[PDB]
Amino acid sequence: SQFTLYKNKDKSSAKTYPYFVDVQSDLLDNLNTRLVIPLTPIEPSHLCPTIHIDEGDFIMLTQQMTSVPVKILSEPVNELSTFRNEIIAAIDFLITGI
C-alpha cells in the first residue's frame, strides 16, 4: 500500500537498509512488483528527506529507489503518508530536476 513502511527481512542488508517505503500508486496494486525507497539510519536534503519516526531517525535514499517483488512486503510497521509531499518532491527532483 502506498507510503506503508515495511521491514527489510534480508539480514545481509537490514542493518544499512532496515526499512523500505512503498511509493507506488494503489491503482496499480494488480502488479506483482512494487516501487520502493529504502531508509537508512542517519547514523542532499531535497533529494533525501529526513524521516523522524517511532522506529528511529532515517534518511530516505530516493536515488536508490528500486522495484521489488510484492511478496517481500510481508512486514508493515508504519505508514508515512504525512511525508507524501516530501516523498513526491524528492522523486520529482530526481527525475524532472524540480
Partner: protein
C-alpha cells in the same frame, strides 16, 4: 466472473481519479486561483474539498452511463455528484494538486477526457454484463 467484478472495480477506481481531473479542467480558472491563494498544500486540499464544483461539460459525459454508474462502491454519499454539483474527496483534491502544467495543453486535456469517456463506456458495459443469472 469473480473477475468481471475485478475489472469493474478497477475501471471505477481509475475513472474516479480522472473524473476529478475532468471537473478541475472544466473549472480551471477558479481551481488555479484557489490553489494560488492557499498558503499551503494542506489548505489547498481543504479548500478544494470544502466547496462544490460546477460539472461543466462533465455532465454531458456522465450520460455515457447510468446514474452514478461510475461511482465506487466505497465512496460515501457526501462525495460525488450531488444536486448537479461535484464534491471532491481529499484523495481527488491531491490528484488535482499533482497535475503538471503540461496537462493543461489542448491535446493532453483531450487525452484525459478521452480516457475518462472510454472508462465510462467500459463501466456501462461491465454493468449490463452483470445480469446474467440471479
Amino acid at each position: 466472473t469473480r473477475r468481471t467484478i475485478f475489472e469493474l472495480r478497477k475501471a471505477r477506481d481509475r475513472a474516479h481519479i480522472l473524473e476529478a481531473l475532468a471537473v478541475a479542467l472544466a473549472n480551471i480558472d477558479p481551481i488555479i486561483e484557489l490553489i494560488r491563494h492557499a498558503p499551503t498544500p494542506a489548505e489547498a486540499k481543504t479548500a478544494l474539498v470544502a466547496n462544490p464544483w460546477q460539472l461543466g461539460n462533465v455532465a454531458a459525459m456522465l450520460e455515457r452511463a447510468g446514474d452514478d454508474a461510475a461511482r465506487p462502491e466505497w465512496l460515501e454519499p457526501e462525495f460525488g455528484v450531488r444536486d448537479g454539483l461535484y464534491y471532491l474527496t481529499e484523495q481527488q483534491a491531491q490528484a488535482i494538486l499533482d497535475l503538471r502544467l503540461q496537462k493543461l495543453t489542448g491535446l493532453e486535456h483531450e487525452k484525459l477526457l478521452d480516457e475518462y469517456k472510454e472508462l465510462l463506456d467500459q463501466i456501462a458495459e461491465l454493468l449490463r454484463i452483470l445480469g446474467s443469472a440471479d
